[PDB]
Amino acid sequence: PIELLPETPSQTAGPYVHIGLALEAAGNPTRDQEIWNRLAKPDAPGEHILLLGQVYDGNGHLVRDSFLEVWQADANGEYQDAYNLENAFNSFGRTATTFDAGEWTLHTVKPGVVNNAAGVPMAPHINISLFARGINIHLHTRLYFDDEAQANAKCPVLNLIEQPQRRETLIAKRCEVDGKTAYRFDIRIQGEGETVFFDF
Amino acid sequence: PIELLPETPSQTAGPYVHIGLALEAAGNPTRDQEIWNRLAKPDAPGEHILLLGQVYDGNGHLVRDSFLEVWQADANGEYQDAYNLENAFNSFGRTATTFDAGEWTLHTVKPGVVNNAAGVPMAPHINISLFARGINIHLHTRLYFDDEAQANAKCPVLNLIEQPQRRETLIAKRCEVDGKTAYRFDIRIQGEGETVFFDF
Amino acid sequence: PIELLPETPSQTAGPYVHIGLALEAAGNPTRDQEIWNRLAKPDAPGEHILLLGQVYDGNGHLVRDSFLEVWQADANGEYQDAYNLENAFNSFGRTATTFDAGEWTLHTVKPGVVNNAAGVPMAPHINISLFARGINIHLHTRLYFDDEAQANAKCPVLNLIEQPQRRETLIAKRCEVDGKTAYRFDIRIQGEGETVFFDF
Amino acid sequence: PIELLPETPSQTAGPYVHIGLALEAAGNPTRDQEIWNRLAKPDAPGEHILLLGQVYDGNGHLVRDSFLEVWQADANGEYQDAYNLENAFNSFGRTATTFDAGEWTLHTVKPGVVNNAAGVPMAPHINISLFARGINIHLHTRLYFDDEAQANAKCPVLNLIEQPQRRETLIAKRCEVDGKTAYRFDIRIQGEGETVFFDF
Amino acid sequence: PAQDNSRFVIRDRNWHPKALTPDYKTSIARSPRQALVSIPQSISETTGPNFSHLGFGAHDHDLLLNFNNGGLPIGERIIVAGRVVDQYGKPVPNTLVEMWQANAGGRCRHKNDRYLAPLDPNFGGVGRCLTDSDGYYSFRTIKPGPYPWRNGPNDWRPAHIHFGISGPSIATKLITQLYFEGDPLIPMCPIVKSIANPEAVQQLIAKLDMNNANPMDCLAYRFDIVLRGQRKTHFENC
Amino acid sequence: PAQDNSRFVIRDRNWHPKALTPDYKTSIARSPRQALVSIPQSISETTGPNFSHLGFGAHDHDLLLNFNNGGLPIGERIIVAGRVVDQYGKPVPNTLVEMWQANAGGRCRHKNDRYLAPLDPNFGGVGRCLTDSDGYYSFRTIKPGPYPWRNGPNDWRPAHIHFGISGPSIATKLITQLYFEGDPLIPMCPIVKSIANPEAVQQLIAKLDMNNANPMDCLAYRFDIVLRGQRKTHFENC
Amino acid sequence: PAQDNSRFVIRDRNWHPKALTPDYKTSIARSPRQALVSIPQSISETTGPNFSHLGFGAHDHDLLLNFNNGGLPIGERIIVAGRVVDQYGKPVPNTLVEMWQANAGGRCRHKNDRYLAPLDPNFGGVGRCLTDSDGYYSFRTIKPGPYPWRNGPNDWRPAHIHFGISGPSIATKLITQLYFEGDPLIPMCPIVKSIANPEAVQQLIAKLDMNNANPMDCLAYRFDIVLRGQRKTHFENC
Ligand SMILES: [Fe+3]
Ligand SMILES: [Fe+3]
Ligand SMILES: [Fe+3]
Ligand SMILES: [Fe+3]
């Protein structure tokens, strides 16, 4: 069979991943430009939302050293790839859960609808990659919104998950935090209620 | 030591086992003569019973593509090996749970008693092989009856299972379906309340 | 691939093949029973014919040490396999061309029609195997009659030969020898006019 | 010594070459644009000629499944490499003999003169590649004209063939087909009068 | 009726595929976590159905003609033959062999298969043959195509034919799969790879069999199936 | 017009198949007996047609759609791709690649083929693609079946696809055949065996290419074709 | 009369000696130049004579007594015995084996042998034996000696016995030669070199069999013959 060069193998990001990529959250001095949890500046188009959550291990204890990276379309359903701190909206961002913040948070807009390769619309979603000590290769998942029930139900990606009860673990539950529209999304790594993870 | 030819290895039966061993259940045209789930004709001797059950995976989800083959003694405790569609009783049959039927059923008689190789009687039982997609090698179990508690208590096979609570998993619960004598035997492949499986 | 045991390889019959199988033609004393060139005794059913010919090498000189074996149906198109010197007709026989007989001869009957494996009639024919010093594995051919032109033309074996001119080399030319119906059939081993040979 | 990558090996073109390179000739539907046997349109410059010939095997039998590709200069001696169906002249074409047509034909112009790498003129010629079932690697020849005996006598290529009588095999005989100027060029693959083939 | 006069050689559970083989995704939640409970053989285990009287139609084993809607299937015509013996090499006569398979394009005639290769209107894909006195069986069918399935993101099943074999008892019954000699998709498959020992994988590869082919018609393949050895009981319960 | 500014590396005639290879029966009477006459290259030999302007239809290279009578062909859907380079490894761009082949069952859509496997009404079997700037070509088709032929009494052609490649000149033109990785009929073939060196046979075997497959759709194969190396003339006629 | 119920495995013509083997000189002008035509097997090729009723004389397989002119032959007394099977390993009972060979000095009893080694007044050199139920045959004879012949200027045929075997059909009939273990002339013989494969030559070598020898009497060689494998027809004309 044709063999190409093999990819460089993955290793765990380690306990100190915050020093190289979550400079602020490790309380080390920053540089002029850091990639962080503010995808949209307060004047970007769309419906502004705050996302928050916790991550669990399989004993149900909190993962306080995890590091996340998110990639979502803007409110028009367009991916913005030229990362710039001056833009109003960036499609990429990074967050973390620390010993002092058991919780991560991200500030962004509800993403607009994008289609898959066959032409079929996907429900609005945010792609998430999770890294942490103990995770040898990172975990891929999608966060979806509990208020988009109809689109969620015709989603060609959510419909590849066989068991209906598994599809729920990907649905963020709407709530409010000081007059701002927020969604919670916990991640269970292992066990009862195990979040669905992807391979692509 | 002495080595014989190796047995050909097993392989899972696959999602499509219906097309080859459960023709009707897969909604394909049948042949004249099929091996199916009616072990006993209406005028066969013994008590007529309907069996029924569900198959669960380890996440508590239903196995809808399972296929089962049963082997049991008649009412006078004799194994009828000559398979013929014109007998009043055949000791063998097959059933399947379908996307359609999450549930399998079998029409037969309650088996009579048989002795083990040492001459000790075994409680009335049905021998079951389970096959499905995800099962590399089939799984062997026995279906016993809750109304035969005296014989189940002295069965030399059920007594080889060390933990009493594990013994219970092989006892079918008497019930009534369309007010006709029935027993339910669900199987748990994995987890909490996991059904005992044998090796022989 | 499945390999069976290999066949014992062929060697040339050699210059002295007559001592083991053409006892008479080598002018050595015979035994009580010899296999020879008289397939039909004068009272066997059918049209009695005499066949004769010569064999050529590729320089056009005569092969005087060749040995032939023939197998043909009787006049009813039936193969007679139980070889017996008392029968009126035998389907098998042997002849030879010697230093003193540059010519072979056989006495038999015109064979009747047999069908091939698909049901299709073959024109009347006689199967010939030719052996001699210089021939490392024997040569298979068929002798056909020039007076059976119509059957010859619908013959499924003669029609596998691509080139029409090659088909002629298999056709024996009718003639008469002292009031007896004879056919000549020369064999050219190599060269101009090369007799068709088969593999089966 | 220095070794380069090896050239991929040839394989015979097979009996069915028509289905891939001679669509019409195999009586399959053609595509819009096909490469065929009309090198010149009616209003192209040069003398219009029809070429024709037969291909014989070594038994003097006709090759009915052959396929030929020709390459020639135009009338002013220039090679027109830009293949287009809208030109008045293309220097390339294909033809085939069929079960139907034992004979191939080509409509073109008589080529003008070209020089060899040393500046010496070559006589007018057509370059021909022959492919067929039984030919493992195609065979290269040149078609020259009998009415150009003065130039054929001084061709630096035809003079590399040592034996004069061998030179003759590449000279097409002028003739008339439906009273239109034509040349016949038959090819003998093997035997008596075998056409010269080249290696370059 | 059936008598207890046979014992069967224990199975080699490290030769066969284990229940938990994670690269084959569906096995995660479909394999037990508790150990199998071993039990002595009795009449229940050592007897099984005899299929000599089941009524077989005339094209039960010929898949080129048993589905038929006025036509021949499209694909490589092949004979799949072999012998069923037990571990001692003793032939298993009058035993039920059942098989099923995709079409030339890898499509299964089952409602659940949505792969984009079309159904062939002259092919069903099921056959059954009862072994003869020397344990021989034979089928005539077309060679199945490989098909994509949803395990890894680009997993394909090598071409295969599923087989069910009864044998003499419920202790010998076995479902397996046949692969085709040479197929480069074989070592890549997670289902084939549920088998840890590579010598066990080789027993599942049917070999090209030129000696059983019909010239100018169809090729063949030879697949021999070895079931558990059968032995008379001796010195039991003294 | 065309200019003489190229020379091509001599062919290796012991690498390629010889003309007389008796086990391939038709070659007996179709191979010369005289020696080939060697000649220097000139403009006649070193130039050849350029096919950049030939008009290609849209499905010329897609055999799943180019014959079409409202349907998909039956058989294994596959991509056959590769690159054409010369002996120095230099890519051959804008070159004509043509191929032809049987259907899933080994039947050729040609009047002359009488094999009993049926014609598929949605398959023709011809494609053509012009190589891109880096020498790449690609086809989409179904995997051909093997077929019986009348050479020896039970000879079968392994599955194959014929290929024609122009290159830059008539000196580089080549017709060959592609085989499929793993096929056990390959070493048995007298036509493949017309090639004496086994390393030359390996160049004709297309490899399974999982990296170019479309998941849940079709597999691929990679077949690279190396044509004669092309070099600038130097120091000629002083 | 005979019925068409068998097919025979095809011959491997690269295993057997080819027709044109130039060091064996007479093969030059006696080998065809056109290819053999292949034809399918019919009742003509699949039936053959059966000799179960030929009347064998009682000494026909015993060459120490069947020529007899008052005494015994001079030379090494040996039994030559073995079995005839088919390629599937199945014995071939009631077949005719014929054999002819020289005397202890290499002279053949024939008009044309003018070799100067004399004739043996008590040896003729011919035997025939029908094989038993089990495929066994046997002869008793003397070991023949080598003989020079007119091939190259100093060629010696090794010691040998010619065999002729019928089998069940004119498709299986064969003529061959038996050589003797360790003869240093075996590998220099052009007739033996007409077989290209060294493992095909080993099957023509009879091996010393001390187990079958009569103590204080004669030695024994074992020679086993394998004929084309015989199978029942299957799936024919559908
Ligand atoms: Fe570290
Ligand atoms: Fe399958
Ligand atoms: Fe001899
Ligand atoms: Fe072909």
PDB file of N, CA and C in Angstrom, chain D residues 151-190:
ATOM      1  N   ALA D 151      15.516  10.275 -54.298  1.00  0.00           N
ATOM      2  CA  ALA D 151      15.738  10.681 -52.899  1.00  0.00           C
ATOM      3  C   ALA D 151      15.889   9.410 -51.973  1.00  0.00           C
ATOM      4  N   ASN D 152      15.164   8.358 -52.320  1.00  0.00           N
ATOM      5  CA  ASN D 152      15.261   7.157 -51.558  1.00  0.00           C
ATOM      6  C   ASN D 152      16.602   6.610 -51.726  1.00  0.00           C
ATOM      7  N   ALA D 153      17.275   6.960 -52.808  1.00  0.00           N
ATOM      8  CA  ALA D 153      18.570   6.313 -53.000  1.00  0.00           C
ATOM      9  C   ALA D 153      19.708   6.888 -52.132  1.00  0.00           C
ATOM     10  N   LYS D 154      19.537   8.162 -51.737  1.00  0.00           N
ATOM     11  CA  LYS D 154      20.425   8.919 -50.977  1.00  0.00           C
ATOM     12  C   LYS D 154      19.846   9.098 -49.474  1.00  0.00           C
ATOM     13  N   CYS D 155      18.787   8.431 -48.991  1.00  0.00           N
ATOM     14  CA  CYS D 155      18.274   8.672 -47.643  1.00  0.00           C
ATOM     15  C   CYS D 155      19.226   8.186 -46.644  1.00  0.00           C
ATOM     16  N   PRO D 156      19.646   9.010 -45.715  1.00  0.00           N
ATOM     17  CA  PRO D 156      20.625   8.412 -44.756  1.00  0.00           C
ATOM     18  C   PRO D 156      20.153   7.341 -43.795  1.00  0.00           C
ATOM     19  N   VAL D 157      18.818   7.181 -43.758  1.00  0.00           N
ATOM     20  CA  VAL D 157      18.238   6.201 -42.855  1.00  0.00           C
ATOM     21  C   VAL D 157      18.115   5.044 -43.673  1.00  0.00           C
ATOM     22  N   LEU D 158      17.380   5.092 -44.833  1.00  0.00           N
ATOM     23  CA  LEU D 158      17.275   3.816 -45.624  1.00  0.00           C
ATOM     24  C   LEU D 158      18.737   3.247 -45.943  1.00  0.00           C
ATOM     25  N   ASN D 159      19.793   4.071 -46.122  1.00  0.00           N
ATOM     26  CA  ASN D 159      21.101   3.515 -46.331  1.00  0.00           C
ATOM     27  C   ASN D 159      21.737   2.799 -45.158  1.00  0.00           C
ATOM     28  N   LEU D 160      21.182   2.903 -43.938  1.00  0.00           N
ATOM     29  CA  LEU D 160      21.719   2.168 -42.768  1.00  0.00           C
ATOM     30  C   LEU D 160      21.228   0.732 -42.840  1.00  0.00           C
ATOM     31  N   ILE D 161      20.289   0.383 -43.704  1.00  0.00           N
ATOM     32  CA  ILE D 161      19.856  -1.015 -43.761  1.00  0.00           C
ATOM     33  C   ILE D 161      20.884  -1.644 -44.749  1.00  0.00           C
ATOM     34  N   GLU D 162      21.655  -2.663 -44.283  1.00  0.00           N
ATOM     35  CA  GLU D 162      22.711  -3.295 -45.046  1.00  0.00           C
ATOM     36  C   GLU D 162      22.328  -3.967 -46.294  1.00  0.00           C
ATOM     37  N   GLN D 163      21.222  -4.686 -46.342  1.00  0.00           N
ATOM     38  CA  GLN D 163      20.880  -5.428 -47.497  1.00  0.00           C
ATOM     39  C   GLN D 163      19.830  -4.791 -48.387  1.00  0.00           C
ATOM     40  N   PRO D 164      20.197  -4.290 -49.551  1.00  0.00           N
ATOM     41  CA  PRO D 164      19.240  -3.665 -50.507  1.00  0.00           C
ATOM     42  C   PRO D 164      17.775  -4.231 -50.619  1.00  0.00           C
ATOM     43  N   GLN D 165      17.639  -5.565 -50.702  1.00  0.00           N
ATOM     44  CA  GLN D 165      16.450  -6.274 -50.807  1.00  0.00           C
ATOM     45  C   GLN D 165      15.522  -6.039 -49.578  1.00  0.00           C
ATOM     46  N   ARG D 166      16.169  -5.742 -48.425  1.00  0.00           N
ATOM     47  CA  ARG D 166      15.508  -5.416 -47.187  1.00  0.00           C
ATOM     48  C   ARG D 166      15.031  -3.991 -47.329  1.00  0.00           C
ATOM     49  N   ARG D 167      15.778  -3.126 -48.042  1.00  0.00           N
ATOM     50  CA  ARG D 167      15.309  -1.766 -48.213  1.00  0.00           C
ATOM     51  C   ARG D 167      14.024  -1.666 -48.907  1.00  0.00           C
ATOM     52  N   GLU D 168      13.820  -2.510 -49.888  1.00  0.00           N
ATOM     53  CA  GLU D 168      12.579  -2.508 -50.716  1.00  0.00           C
ATOM     54  C   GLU D 168      11.242  -2.623 -49.956  1.00  0.00           C
ATOM     55  N   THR D 169      11.283  -3.410 -48.874  1.00  0.00           N
ATOM     56  CA  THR D 169      10.137  -3.662 -47.954  1.00  0.00           C
ATOM     57  C   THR D 169       9.539  -2.363 -47.337  1.00  0.00           C
ATOM     58  N   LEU D 170      10.282  -1.292 -47.346  1.00  0.00           N
ATOM     59  CA  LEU D 170       9.733  -0.078 -46.865  1.00  0.00           C
ATOM     60  C   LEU D 170       9.249   0.855 -48.017  1.00  0.00           C
ATOM     61  N   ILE D 171       9.156   0.404 -49.257  1.00  0.00           N
ATOM     62  CA  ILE D 171       8.735   1.293 -50.368  1.00  0.00           C
ATOM     63  C   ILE D 171       7.309   0.991 -50.768  1.00  0.00           C
ATOM     64  N   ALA D 172       6.435   1.967 -50.516  1.00  0.00           N
ATOM     65  CA  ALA D 172       5.046   1.864 -50.852  1.00  0.00           C
ATOM     66  C   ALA D 172       4.863   1.912 -52.474  1.00  0.00           C
ATOM     67  N   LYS D 173       3.933   1.102 -53.049  1.00  0.00           N
ATOM     68  CA  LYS D 173       3.768   1.017 -54.542  1.00  0.00           C
ATOM     69  C   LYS D 173       2.665   1.891 -54.869  1.00  0.00           C
ATOM     70  N   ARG D 174       2.930   2.865 -55.760  1.00  0.00           N
ATOM     71  CA  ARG D 174       1.897   3.830 -56.278  1.00  0.00           C
ATOM     72  C   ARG D 174       0.839   3.118 -57.064  1.00  0.00           C
ATOM     73  N   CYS D 175      -0.391   3.541 -56.898  1.00  0.00           N
ATOM     74  CA  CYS D 175      -1.537   2.890 -57.493  1.00  0.00           C
ATOM     75  C   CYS D 175      -2.682   3.831 -57.421  1.00  0.00           C
ATOM     76  N   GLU D 176      -3.845   3.340 -57.793  1.00  0.00           N
ATOM     77  CA  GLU D 176      -5.029   4.191 -57.857  1.00  0.00           C
ATOM     78  C   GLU D 176      -6.217   3.505 -57.306  1.00  0.00           C
ATOM     79  N   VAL D 177      -6.924   4.165 -56.421  1.00  0.00           N
ATOM     80  CA  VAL D 177      -8.122   3.606 -55.770  1.00  0.00           C
ATOM     81  C   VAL D 177      -9.245   4.561 -56.148  1.00  0.00           C
ATOM     82  N   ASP D 178     -10.295   4.018 -56.825  1.00  0.00           N
ATOM     83  CA  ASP D 178     -11.364   4.863 -57.368  1.00  0.00           C
ATOM     84  C   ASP D 178     -10.746   6.057 -58.124  1.00  0.00           C
ATOM     85  N   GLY D 179      -9.753   5.672 -58.939  1.00  0.00           N
ATOM     86  CA  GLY D 179      -9.003   6.574 -59.756  1.00  0.00           C
ATOM     87  C   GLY D 179      -8.544   7.824 -59.065  1.00  0.00           C
ATOM     88  N   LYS D 180      -7.901   7.639 -57.904  1.00  0.00           N
ATOM     89  CA  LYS D 180      -7.395   8.702 -57.054  1.00  0.00           C
ATOM     90  C   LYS D 180      -6.076   8.086 -56.592  1.00  0.00           C
ATOM     91  N   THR D 181      -5.066   8.959 -56.560  1.00  0.00           N
ATOM     92  CA  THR D 181      -3.657   8.659 -56.237  1.00  0.00           C
ATOM     93  C   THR D 181      -3.612   8.028 -54.832  1.00  0.00           C
ATOM     94  N   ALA D 182      -2.978   6.840 -54.774  1.00  0.00           N
ATOM     95  CA  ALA D 182      -2.848   5.976 -53.614  1.00  0.00           C
ATOM     96  C   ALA D 182      -1.582   5.200 -53.624  1.00  0.00           C
ATOM     97  N   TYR D 183      -1.172   4.793 -52.417  1.00  0.00           N
ATOM     98  CA  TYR D 183       0.002   3.960 -52.249  1.00  0.00           C
ATOM     99  C   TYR D 183      -0.347   2.849 -51.306  1.00  0.00           C
ATOM    100  N   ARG D 184       0.142   1.682 -51.557  1.00  0.00           N
ATOM    101  CA  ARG D 184       0.002   0.577 -50.830  1.00  0.00           C
ATOM    102  C   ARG D 184       1.336   0.131 -50.200  1.00  0.00           C
ATOM    103  N   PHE D 185       1.139  -0.072 -48.871  1.00  0.00           N
ATOM    104  CA  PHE D 185       2.121  -0.436 -47.973  1.00  0.00           C
ATOM    105  C   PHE D 185       1.669  -1.567 -47.092  1.00  0.00           C
ATOM    106  N   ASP D 186       1.968  -2.798 -47.480  1.00  0.00           N
ATOM    107  CA  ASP D 186       1.580  -3.913 -46.647  1.00  0.00           C
ATOM    108  C   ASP D 186       2.771  -4.150 -45.784  1.00  0.00           C
ATOM    109  N   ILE D 187       2.545  -4.778 -44.606  1.00  0.00           N
ATOM    110  CA  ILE D 187       3.580  -5.110 -43.718  1.00  0.00           C
ATOM    111  C   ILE D 187       3.596  -6.604 -43.479  1.00  0.00           C
ATOM    112  N   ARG D 188       4.782  -7.192 -43.541  1.00  0.00           N
ATOM    113  CA  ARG D 188       4.951  -8.578 -43.183  1.00  0.00           C
ATOM    114  C   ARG D 188       5.652  -8.616 -41.742  1.00  0.00           C
ATOM    115  N   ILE D 189       4.993  -9.134 -40.654  1.00  0.00           N
ATOM    116  CA  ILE D 189       5.600  -9.154 -39.314  1.00  0.00           C
ATOM    117  C   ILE D 189       6.716 -10.110 -39.301  1.00  0.00           C
ATOM    118  N   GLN D 190       6.501 -11.191 -39.979  1.00  0.00           N
ATOM    119  CA  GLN D 190       7.522 -12.211 -39.917  1.00  0.00           C
ATOM    120  C   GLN D 190       7.631 -13.016 -41.229  1.00  0.00           C
TER     121      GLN D 190
END
